[PDB]
Amino acid sequence: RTSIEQRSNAVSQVLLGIFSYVRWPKEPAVLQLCVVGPTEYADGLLRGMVQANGRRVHAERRAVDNPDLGTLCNVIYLGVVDERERQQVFRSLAGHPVLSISERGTECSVGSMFCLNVGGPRITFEANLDSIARSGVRVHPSVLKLARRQATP
Amino acid sequence: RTSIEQRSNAVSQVLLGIFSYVRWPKEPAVLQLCVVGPTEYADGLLRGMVQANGRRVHAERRAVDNPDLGTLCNVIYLGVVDERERQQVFRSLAGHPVLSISERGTECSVGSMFCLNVGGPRITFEANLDSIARSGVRVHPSVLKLAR
Ligand SMILES: Nc1nc2c(ncn2[C@@H]2O[C@H](COP(=O)(O)O)[C@@H](O)[C@H]2O)c(=O)[nH]1
């Protein structure tokens, strides 16, 4: 199988891959990533990242109940939350141009744009068209080339 | 520093305190901390910590399904797990001198020796006397005076 350290650094790479199919209407100088809820694989994310075009991705944790997530965060990496916590977060986001990714696949039904599946030999992910449409950001459909090619043994 | 980063530090300071009331059958040169499962506040632990007596605490994440948890870890900081993962974890711990703490602990009825409660103006924690009794490590009784 695959160690926690192995998967962490993979997740950060898959996320860099997703970020590249996403456009914000008002592109920031520093992309702000916010890790919300308990997470297993965001340890690599939280070191900061760098996009291929040179833009820095600043990452930090925020409280679920933070009323201004959607404002403080450009991208949001969602960890293990409960029904109440989730509704909080996705209400905090509603209206704003924000990309949401989840560490576990269960959250796609309930508000997340991309959901990861870190188990297995590779990291695959899934998307939700409803959540993406209402997101406020633009996503090129080629982003699934990455989800399909990661699922291909 | 956000509220998570400050609580992350408080979680550090609290775990260090709790450590100072625990003893290992054979005390190790470096204390092995294992962060296991989804966590919010383990970011301070993971940066490394040093005890009052100067000992390095080395912290690293390990898988829930890791079968060698009992021998790889001196202390386990347990994040979110379900009943199967919990049971699995403690099967891997039984028979080894391992101090166990968990980031969430409304109940503290079954599982870890101590359970944190990071919510609120300050960090509190409760003790599970049964887990403490049969764990392998000695716990100076005075620590319960630091509990809720
Ligand atoms: N403060 C302190 N307590 C110790 C030390 N070594 C052992 N102890 C405590 O003494 C206990 C032994 O208890 P006893 O043998 O009296 O029944 C150990 O489990 C531990 O709690 C030490 O170096 N310092």
Alpha carbon of B91 to ligand 1 centroid (Å): 27
Cβ contacts of B138 within 8 Å, gap of 6 or more: B22, B23
Phi–psi pair at A42, nearest 5 degrees: -90, 0
Q: How far away is chain A from the Cα of B60, in angstroms, using its nearest Cα?
A: 9
Those residues of chain B whose CB sits closer than 8 Å to some CB in chain A are 2-5, 8, 37-40, 43, 46, 60-63, 79-80, 103
- From start to end of A37-140, where are the E strands? 49-50, 56-62, 75-78, 99-102, 114-117, 124-127, 138-139
Asked whether A64 and A85 are in contact (CB, 8 A), the reply is yes
Cβ contacts of B13 within 8 Å, gap of 6 or more: none
In angstroms, the CA B76 to CA B137 distance is 13
Nearest residue (by CA) to ligand 1, atom 17, is B138
Nearest residue (by CA) to ligand 1, atom 12, is B138
Q: What is the CA radius of gyration of chain B?
A: 14
In angstroms, the CA B144 to CA B148 distance is 8
Phi–psi pair at A92, nearest 5 degrees: -60, -20
B138 lines ligand 1 (CB under 6 A): yes
B140 lines ligand 1 (CB under 6 A): yes
Nearest CA in chain A to B61: A4
Write out chain B residues lying below 8 Å of A8, CB-based.
61
Residue A55 annotated as lining a ligand binding site: no
B23 lines ligand 1 (CB under 6 A): yes
In angstroms, the CA B43 to CA A79 distance is 15
Nearest residue (by CA) to ligand 1, atom 19, is B138
Nearest residue (by CA) to ligand 1, atom 22, is B23
Asked whether A113 and A132 are in contact (CB, 8 A), the reply is yes
- Helices (H) and strands (E) counted in chain B, each on its own, are 4, 9
Structure tokens at B110: 């079954």
Q: How far away is chain B from the Cα of A148, in angstroms, using its nearest Cα?
A: 26
Phi–psi pair at B115, nearest 5 degrees: -130, 125
Nearest CA in chain A to B64: A4
CB atoms within 10 A of CB A48: 12
Experimental determination technique? X-ray
Q: Residue A139 region, left (φ>0) first, then alpha (ψ -120 to 50), else beta?
A: beta
Nearest CA in chain A to B5: A61
Structure tokens at B78: 């347990």
In angstroms, the CA A109 to CA B40 distance is 23
What 3-state class would DSSP assign to A46?
helix
Q: How far away is chain B from the Cα of A73, in angstroms, using its nearest Cα?
A: 13
